[PDB]
Design a protein around this ligand. Sequence first.
Ligand SMILES: *CC(=O)[C@H](CC(=O)O)NC(=O)c1ccc(CNS(=O)(=O)c2ccc(O)c(C(=O)O)c2)cc1
Ligand SMILES: *CC(=O)[C@H](CC(=O)O)NC(=O)c1ccc(CNS(=O)(=O)c2ccc(O)c(C(=O)O)c2)cc1
Lengths: 240, 240
Amino acid sequence: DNSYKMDYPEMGLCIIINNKNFHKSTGMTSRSGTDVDAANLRETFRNLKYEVRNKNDLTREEIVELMRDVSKEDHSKRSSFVCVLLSHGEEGIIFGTNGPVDLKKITNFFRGDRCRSLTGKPKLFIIQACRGTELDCGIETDDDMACHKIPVDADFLYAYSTAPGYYSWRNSKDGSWFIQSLCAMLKQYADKLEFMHILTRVNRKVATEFESFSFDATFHAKKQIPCIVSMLTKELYFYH
Amino acid sequence: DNSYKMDYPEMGLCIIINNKNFHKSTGMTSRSGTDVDAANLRETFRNLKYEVRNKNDLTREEIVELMRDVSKEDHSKRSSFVCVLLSHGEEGIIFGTNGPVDLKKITNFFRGDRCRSLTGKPKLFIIQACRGTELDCGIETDDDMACHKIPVDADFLYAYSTAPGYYSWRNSKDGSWFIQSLCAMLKQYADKLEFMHILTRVNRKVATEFESFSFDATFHAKKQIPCIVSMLTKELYFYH
Ligand SMILES: *CC(=O)[C@H](CC(=O)O)NC(=O)c1ccc(CNS(=O)(=O)c2ccc(O)c(C(=O)O)c2)cc1
Ligand SMILES: *CC(=O)[C@H](CC(=O)O)NC(=O)c1ccc(CNS(=O)(=O)c2ccc(O)c(C(=O)O)c2)cc1
């Protein structure tokens, strides 16, 4: 029908890569507050019946190896796959503790031709990381081959914390604006709303309720809009 | 609320930029079939009650001047804004008849801080153009500042014909896979489904029903998935 089959015996894995401390050589600062996000996500996805695996402070090599190994598991009995990345980033890039890795390298292991037991199933990548350094100042308000094949990039969804090219906000006490919002809206709406509609509420929450406050005028009164990228081919409900 | 107000006196403008013939220096071939796309879009959006303006074979300077001018119109009585680009492209780039221009230069005129009469209203950019040269081989199956402000990048939706880095297919006789599918799903579902759900059906239609056939193996048996990029903050229904 019009929605993904989510009544396989297992909902699937939820891999959370939580990079907090970075090698001195990289110059990257410790991501205070990321443990709050990681715990929030773990509970949130546990409640949606995902098999959560938390991984901390992985090098880029370990990230790639982890994703390769996970993609070689047999996911036949699982409805979907979720991977959450919490780290520093730039456009198209997430950081290991020792340096950058392209997101495409991580996601390619899950292409429809490379992970066959996830073919036709939604593969969700949730990314809390910057996509560049820009700050949003805001504004005051007939040959029939039907289904012989599917594209290898079909059935991926990326839930980015921020717009292309932009900074992504996090605070030590409450975690990141995006993950805070995402978890809240999943807690409230996962048993009732289709996923793109949940993510749209997340966009509104981040866009409307958060604004930076800083003694540094260059860092003050800033705003953020998350960015949903869907190559999904069906509606996704976490319930059946 | 949860959905955009779509009962202003006018649905809004639908600008269709149809680039078919290109200057010698571009090395770009004539985009046979694009007029089928242009006409299908004109009729589809007319039926949704948008004020359609078709523009043909614009240089990149004319595109930028056109967008600047349109963004300076008073859109107070309009619910939304639609811009469709039909041309050659690369990632982040659309071609004027005389060469490339960054999409960001076109969309920037419509930011929340730069086009005030569209602040808070959905701005949709529908893009039929390649995003690179890859071909998809497929696989057989405390502080209350709550508004206040919104991000300047809020309330944009991009409906890209294809995934990042990939080719985008066009048929010399029926038009492009994406635009044919988009017009068909709007015709069938605009009176019944929220817009992300209509685009999801477009994704499925393109992914499942189309597969290239070519005497050249390089171009044979290829697939395509469109790519929805939402920075919207509410649900969008074309009926009220
Ligand atoms: C650029 C990047 O990849 C990372 C992404 C990430 O770590 O999630 N972003 C940052 O490194 C980053 C670092 C620091 C801050 C600001 N944090 S703060 O100083 O605690 C702060 C100041 C003012 C203010 O209003 C807030 C707030 O949350 O509202 C936080 C942001 C991003
Ligand atoms: C690269 C780029 O930006 C543009 C985008 C665009 O024009 O919309 N793409 C192309 O330039 C382009 C050119 C030619 C074709 C193939 N067209 S065809 O020769 O009519 C054809 C051959 C085989 C085949 O199977 C089809 C089909 O529709 O199935 C069409 C594609 C893109």
